[PDB]
Design a protein around this ligand. Structure first.
Ligand SMILES: *C(=O)CCCCCCCCCCCCC
Length: 10
């Protein structure tokens, strides 16, 4: 959830 945000970001 933070990845998409942290990995993926945005
Ligand atoms: C927040 O929603 C985290 C989800 C980010 C997507 C990860 C999907 C892939 C999961 C398998 C990778 C190995 C598991 C740690």
């Amino acid at each position: 959830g933070k990845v998409l945000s942290k990995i993926f970001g945005n």
